[PDB]
Amino acid sequence: MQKDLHPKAVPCKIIYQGQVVMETMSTRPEIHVDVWSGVHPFWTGEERFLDTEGRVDKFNKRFGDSYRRGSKK
RNA sequence: GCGGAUUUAGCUCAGUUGGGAGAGCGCCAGACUGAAGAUCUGGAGGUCCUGUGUUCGAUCCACAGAAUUCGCACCA
RNA sequence: GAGCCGGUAGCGGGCGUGGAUCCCUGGAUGUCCGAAUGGGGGAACCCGGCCGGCGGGAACGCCGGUCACCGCGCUUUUGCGCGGGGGGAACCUGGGGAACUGAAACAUCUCAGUACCCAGAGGAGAGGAAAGAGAAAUCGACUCCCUGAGUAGCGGCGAGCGAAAGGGGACCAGCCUAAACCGUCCGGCUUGUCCGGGCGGGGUCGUGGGGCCCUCGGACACCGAAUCCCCAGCCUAGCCGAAGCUGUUGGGAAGCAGCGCCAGAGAGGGUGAAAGCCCCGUAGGCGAAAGGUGGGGGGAUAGGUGAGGGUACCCGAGUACCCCGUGGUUCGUGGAGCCAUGGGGGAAUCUGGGCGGACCACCGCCUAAGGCUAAGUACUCCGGGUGACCGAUAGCGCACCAGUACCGUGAGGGAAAGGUGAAAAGAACCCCGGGAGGGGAGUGAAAUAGAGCCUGAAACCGUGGGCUUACAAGCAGUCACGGCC
RNA sequence: GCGUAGGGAAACCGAGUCCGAACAGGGCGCAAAGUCCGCGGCCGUGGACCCGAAACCGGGCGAGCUAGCCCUGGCCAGGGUGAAGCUGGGGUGAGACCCAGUGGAGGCCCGAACCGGUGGGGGAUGCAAACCCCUCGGAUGAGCUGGGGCUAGGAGUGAAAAGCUAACCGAGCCCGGAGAUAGCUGGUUCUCCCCGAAAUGACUUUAGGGUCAGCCUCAGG
RNA sequence: GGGGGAUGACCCCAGGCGGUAGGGGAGCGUUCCCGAUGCCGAUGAAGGCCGACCCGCGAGGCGGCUGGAGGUAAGGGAAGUGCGAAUGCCGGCAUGAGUAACGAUAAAGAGGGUGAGAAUCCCUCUCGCCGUAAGCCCAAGGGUUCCUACGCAAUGGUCGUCAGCGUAGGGUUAGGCGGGACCUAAGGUGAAGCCGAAAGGCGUAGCCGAAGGGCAGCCGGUUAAUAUUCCGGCCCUUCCCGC
RNA sequence: CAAAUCCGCCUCCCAACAAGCUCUGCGUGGUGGGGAAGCCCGUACGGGUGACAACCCCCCGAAGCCAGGGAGCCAAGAAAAGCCUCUAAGCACAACCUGCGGGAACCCGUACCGCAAACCGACACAGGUGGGCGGGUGCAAGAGCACUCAGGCGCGCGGGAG
RNA sequence: CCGCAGUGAACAGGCUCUGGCGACUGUUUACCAAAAACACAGCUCUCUGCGAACUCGUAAGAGGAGGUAUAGGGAGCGACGCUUGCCCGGUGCCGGAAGGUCAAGGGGAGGGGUGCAAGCCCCGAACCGAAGCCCCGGUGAACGGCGGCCGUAACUAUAACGGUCCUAAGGUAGCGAAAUUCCUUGUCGGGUAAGUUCCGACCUGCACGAAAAGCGUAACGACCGGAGCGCUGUCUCGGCGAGGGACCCGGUGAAAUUGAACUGGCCGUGAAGAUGCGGCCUACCCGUGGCAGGACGAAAAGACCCCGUGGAGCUUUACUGCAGCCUGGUGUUGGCUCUUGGUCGCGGCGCGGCUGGGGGCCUAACCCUCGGAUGGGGGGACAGCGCUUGGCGGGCAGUUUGACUGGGGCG
RNA sequence: GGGGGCCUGACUGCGAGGCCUGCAAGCCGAGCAGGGGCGAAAGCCGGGCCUAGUGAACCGGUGGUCCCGUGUGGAAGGGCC
16 A cells, blocks of 8 residues: 555546447437546655655645644644 | 538639729730730620518628538437 | 273283273473574574573583564653464455356447455454435334335346335344533643643534523433353263063074063164163263353443523534546436545535435425444354265265375376174194195184175186087078977 | 236226227227146246367466576587788888798688487387487587576567477466357167157248248147 | 946947157156055075066066075155166276287307206306496485395296395494585565555665685595595694683 | 775885795605415405515606696676775783694585486386596597407397298 | 508598579577578668667566667668669658647537526537648658550561550669469570470560669578489399398287178179179188288378358458557646737727736746765756546457358359 | 319328238228318219339437426426327
8 A cells, every 4th residue: 555645545446438429419329448547646745753754645635734634744 | 411611704703881893814806927926905704693671772781592612410 | 980001903011999091171391394583594404692500521611591573552761561463164344356158240238246366354244323214294223034026117228137115024222532612731832812632521313512690400220341159051071870581493582482560761773683671871850060151130330321491602524515537326328316436626514514316496304524333144164963865986076094196397186995704713733835825624604704705796718518510691580390408 | 916897108087998079990898706735748047958179268387398588617539721910031212012931810621529400211009209220510609518597478488480488389287267158969768558740931140040830739619 | 439337347330550750648667755543584684696477568476596684665755767879987808819019130158056946046167249338436316226134926028046126134424525604796585765456566785595706634444335534644724721 | 995004196216037925846754555475264255364566767748737827819708705904992911913732623414326227208118418537559630430458248038940 | 572452441522514592600490391481790761869769567667778879779681793763643651830620628699497586507609729630842772653555667577756545653774484474395596316394595574673672693502403424223123142020939918990790702783882682603611921902991070171140360441449659628837027819898099807829047846966965956837747638549459251152252 | 095174182080891911011991070172963082093112119300299297386308199
């Protein structure tokens, strides 16, 4: 576990898949894709209880970063 | 067939003040030539896509069609 | 309760009712590997500090004990004292997660959220007091069984997939904390009124909590534990335990005959061939302990909450809600919601804020954005019970020097093979022979029951006999007539 | 929960109803009434009459096979050919440049071990799942090699034919999906009674399948 | 089908009856559960072995021989049920067949000896084949296979008194040889550090890692086997205490 | 070359066949062997063990012995014990070098096979498997060749016709 | 001096004449094929300025390379010599980006539902808006392609010339019946007793050709083909022999296939190639050493075939989709200034809110940087990187690509 | 079949009862009602002289309904034409 936020999780899942609409606005739709991928934020440098730096991403990051709910800066 | 682009001389096209129908050609003719060509002169060139309407007056403004063209829409 | 030094029957020697073998439970040793963890490493091996005797050190110096890995709290000081990790057939939730095949192709779909891998909890986890369900102003935890229903419904509307409230049933069951309001302080900024963290207030079940003013009011309300012995159940052995003998065919009787008894225990099994009464430590039925684990149930522990109005009000979360992109749901892009979220905007603290399936008015429900919660269902490694369940090519493949022999470098595969008898009384001795094996004697009911020695069939190889066979065709053969036996 | 009416997309009506504005038809009324169970011939889901393949998909398993690549040693008996050079001499200014000596390179030649394996011979239930015989190429080099290791099996490696990857890789092998599907193929058991078939027609990514008909059989009228 | 059936059965005649897929009816044995007011057997359960009574039949009964202990159901129920037959599975057993093979055309033969028995063993004497091997040696691999006394049942593609076969006993000793108690490259690990959905990936220093580096001896003797270790003669090294 | 005396770099003097320190010959201390014996003894599974031995000269001469050589060349040839410099630091009448004398020295490996019936090929299978001189005579040379030295063996089925 | 012989035995090239391809030593398909196949030294286009570009990788990271344009990767040929010509209409690509188009998106006319009403949800469109594609050009050691017929001196035949229709031009130099030439054993020549192989020459080249080079080329090859001398049982039949099985002895003692069988020829037959069925003719019972014909002999449920709306591998303008790559808006991506466009309001200009484009050092993220420390340095709002957009996209993944068919196909 | 007169039934609601037929289709048709046109009227008209000018059901558009409308008031949306 080394790709999340610290101040909460947000990684994983992701069942994408494209098609060729054309519905309600007349006739019916169609299907295709069948893949799976990722989806997340980014991480910055901080620190806690003797150095540590942290990581976690935006959102959250905007938070605790501002504040700090287990270790500040 | 969903939308946009337009509609003037034989061809290709300008045309915005709502009042002159215009240009180029090209085409025809005259001049010149031994002739034709090139140049100069000149002339013609008409369903301003059709109809109806608005207006003192319509290529121009308003109302359908049409046609051409480009893109798009496609599970009867 | 009186025999034993395990399966070894054999030699050689020995303990024992001034309670041996063994059955129990709690012990002390537990060499080396293995999470290994002192250090290294091709496991089961080889290497280091501290203490240690001091030890042969015959007039000369060693094993033993020990000890210490690393991630976890945090009495922080120089950090001293607690937990973890490795397993584990099956079953559990999360994390991740697929083709075949059906659709008589195949891209949607299906198999499925299945198979597998991963992590991790437990003895059970899962889940669990509702921003729930639905609409009779009706219901209320979660779970599980039946039912709802193969219905409402999803869909190249094709193959298929296929809910739920309500009713019946098992069980019942409820609680907390931030939740800055109050006061306590401790530490900061730097003295005020800021954030901070330990103490209580409250610490919300179905709307309340505080803070103020007057009524208060002045003892039976135990949970998931906490506790005491209680029946602590079991834990292996606990032990009594009804009642026949003669005669007899028998190698053997418990059979055939005669009389005789039992009895809540004629369950079966062992007994030389079929017993209620011979053995059975069985069902009859009562029995039983000083240690290891419960409910029931008794008590205090009891932890713990438990009434009245009023007031302008401040107090369960960082993201609800909305846009796009996926999930789960019966919903496969759909008129398509709720809950869950990948990115971006980023509200309110009770006339607040989601909800009852686009939305809107009105009505009705609920009060989130933290947490704990035994019991009712699942699963057999283990122990027992029972069988219209099997008998050695069936059953687990493996009924007992098998997951071993054996092929595979490996992962892995993975067999075959049980039976004499009543018990050995298991064949002393004599014979041919190098022996094995064969001839007698002896056990004996029988050894053509004789040592892989019960039954021991066929196929197939022999030894004798009857008939038959040399100018003759067809697997076969079957009908006629003849001779030998 | 099936029967107790049903008719209709529905509202809803109802022994009547839907189309409709018309007494013209469709569904039904007319009770004939089941229902549970048992035992059977069948039909769907099922691995489901029984074994049969090539393949796809998951997790492991291997370079003591072989192709490579890294590290580190060992190894090539003899002989032959004779370039750079350096020494000396050679007509010119020095030289180019010539010659003679020395000299000893080259994936160089002739050949053992060693590496190979065309060209013929044997062998074909061999000595052997590639070997024996005669013969041949390479023979200080993109040389042969031991020991230590690295990569890996939809991916590796490959002086590259789809080769080699533990003796058949056109995508390894074991366990798992799983007893995959399998109009095709076989296989498909004791007696006896009764009757007695088709090998056409219609539509099919259907033609050596199968739907519906046609020809069989049993129960009642 | 029909004429009367008492339950059978009997009579007429009509009237056929060859039949695979396949349709309907009726019966047979197979191992089990009843013991529907059921039990046989040591003078044989059952299976086996053999047969000129009962049935259309698939089976019955019954009698003779075998063999050591069971099980039968007069009737209804249940099912892992009837087999040549699947190049089927498993086991045995015949074929070809007393022919094909003895694993290199580097050959033997003779005398004696032992033994129950020797072309195939032991001694001995001729003879043939090596000789770059069919040499001793170090390794790697395999692990008692090595020696000695007994023995041959099977393995030895024949024998076999022989064995690298059986049982028993015994054999291999090192301050200086090799491995460690020293060193690192590849590579592998790997506190810190760096990134994964989880398992994990990488990876500094340090460590693991070898016939590469390094390190202190040699020749003779001595048993059935060992030997640079055992003998002895000769040559050394590191640590420690003392001065 | 993170810190000074080390080595690296510049300057002046001794800048040799000088002196330095690590392998072969003599040898030789002194030991062994030593074959042909060999009286006791197997005079034979012969040899275990006692004469004396002799122990000498010339000849050939390495593809890796001194040695980290020298010469040439290009594709231009691995990292940690020892030796000297020293901080921390303690010795500095007790730290390291040396000398003599006494004391200490482990863990696990060896048999025999080993161009192989004992190793891989399932078998006593004319298949493969890495290093060391490989004895001589002859052939221009040479681990090629023919015979043989030491040592090994006759293939593990023998006769008999042709 | 001697014998037939004097490396006496033993180990030890046959040579030559010619042609074709590839230069050459090589390397490779272990158990058929060592070759004209790859490899190459050598050439040419060519992507790339680093933190490269491409290859593995889920993000780290390694590789690259402690390389740095005399370099690193992509490539078609493959000494050397001589020489590589003609066409960019389509295609890939490089450049262009003014114009059309067009996604998400901004951004408002307007309509709609409920609404007593403020409101409260959608549909929404004029215009601005990305790569891509369309359109202009450049592009050949980039893919690829590089004309047809009629007439004419030609006493006879293209041709020196001429006439044309289409195309982007319309084969050039060298070569030629080559291993690209089926009419063909083409026609001439040489080689021979004749020669459909060769080798030379013509050349109407069924279909060579310069870059998967083209003509040739010393040496070079276990390559392939053509010829001459030498020599031998290869052959004119061979005929003899030596050693090894086979045969007789003793010892041992398998193996696939097979329903079963005492299995004769005939001529006929049957499902049309019979020992077994019909007629007939020869016909005693068994064996061993042999010889192959028949028993449709053995091996293996044909690989050639078709059929199952079976399977598996490679291919492109097959279908779809993903990996990666380009790409608009959005985010942790902060300041300062220079500016033009739209718009509605009050061709215009003045203003105004609105909002769009863009140019700048900075710079506090971010990243990188390092160069000896945490500071400096460089870049910097990038970008990495997250989310949605769109696009290319056979690199890969999964399916598919009918029936008839008097054999499958083509038709 | 050739002209001219007005006229459109080139109809809705239906159709007794048959052809061909495994399926679905395909095809015919008096007569009944509402409402016309042509004729004085008896009658003919529900396109053509015919037999070819073709297509399932779903996947959707649209003009009509005012049948459903997922708490009731409605609308998205759906059923029927």
